[PDB]
Every structure is written in C-alpha cells, then in structure tokens.
Amino acid sequence: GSSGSSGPPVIRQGPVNQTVAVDGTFVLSCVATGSPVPTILWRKDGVLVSTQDSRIKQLENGVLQIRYAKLGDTGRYTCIASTPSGEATWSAYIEVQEFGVPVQPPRPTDPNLIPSAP
16 A cells, blocks of 8 residues: 555644734745645634635645735634644634724614604
8 A cells, every 4th residue: 555654744833923904914824744735724713714705815735815804803713734644733813903094983774763754
C-alpha cells in the first residue's frame, strides 16, 4: 500500500488575534502538514462558515479573506485540519471596532397598526 507517510497533522502557524475596523478587511491563514495536504476549514461561533457571500472568498489553499467586516462579524474564528492520519485545530479571535462612520440609527418601522383614512 503506502510505505511510510508524513504522519499526524501539526499546525506550525495559523491565524492570530488581530484588531480590525468596521467595513475593514481581516485575513486569516492556516498552515498544517500532512499528506495529502490538510484541509483548512473555517467556523464562526461554532458554525460552518458561509462561503457564499462575496465578502468571504478563498484566494489560495487554506487562505480566506473577509472584506467589509461589520460589527456583527465580531466573532472567534477557528481553523480545522482534517487528514487520514489525524486532525488538529487552532485558536483565533477577531474584534471589529467602528471608526470614521457617522451615526447609523435604526429604520423607522411601525407596529403595523391600522392605516390613516384622512
């Protein structure tokens, strides 16, 4: 079959806690060994990342980029490496702070009461 193998996955370097401004851009890279190459995944608040919004895109292998970091994005990102020899993860937190943005109050919504005749 396979004579000799790299071994268990080991994250030599990954994402580190960094501060970013609102509507900014925070990048995260996850490095891990293992043959075949380990699969770098992403999870937000213990949930599978939503790689559907233009905001989140994958430029390279394991390299993810999230543009337009909103205040609601303030979460803890974690990397996951799956391999036929083992699996490892990493810790990383991202904070979003508003700066240079004007007051953005809520939208004027009504209780859906009865309409005004006159």
